[PDB]
Amino acid sequence: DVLPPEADSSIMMLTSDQKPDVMYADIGGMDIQKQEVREAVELPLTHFELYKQIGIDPPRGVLMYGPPG
């Protein structure tokens, strides 16, 4: 027999209710850098149906680069 599955193994997740968390609203200079994350996070997660309606498949592509800054 297999697991339920599962309690799994490592980490796992949380890190918010068990902390830490930091408010992003302090830094507004990244607004145009958040423009991607704006459309590329919330609706991709909360709507899989809209991607059937538009005729375009949601990408998994996200990048970051440059540090520092």
Partner 1 sequence: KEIKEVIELPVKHPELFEALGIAQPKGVLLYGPPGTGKTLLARAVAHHTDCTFIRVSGSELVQKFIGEGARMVRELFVMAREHAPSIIFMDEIDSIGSSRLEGGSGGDSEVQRTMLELLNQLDGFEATKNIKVIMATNRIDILDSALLRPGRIDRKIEFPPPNEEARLDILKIHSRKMNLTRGINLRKIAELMPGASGA
Q: Tell me which residues touch partner 1 (CB under 8 A).
A: 53-56
CB of 49 to partner 1, least distance (A): 12
The token pair at 37 is 């994350």
- Evaluate whether 62 touches 36 at the Cβ level (below 8 Å): yes
Cβ distance to partner 1 smaller for residue 37 or 50: 50
H or E stretch including 46? Answer: helix 31-46
Q: Which is nearer to partner 1, 18 or 53 (CB)?
A: 53
Q: How far is the CB of 57 from partner 1 (least distance, A)?
A: 9
Q: Is 67 annotated as a binding residue?
A: yes
Buried b (16+ CB within 10 A) or exposed e, 46-61: eeeeeeeeeeeeeeee
61 is in an annotated binding site: no
Does the annotation flag 69 for ligand binding? Answer: yes
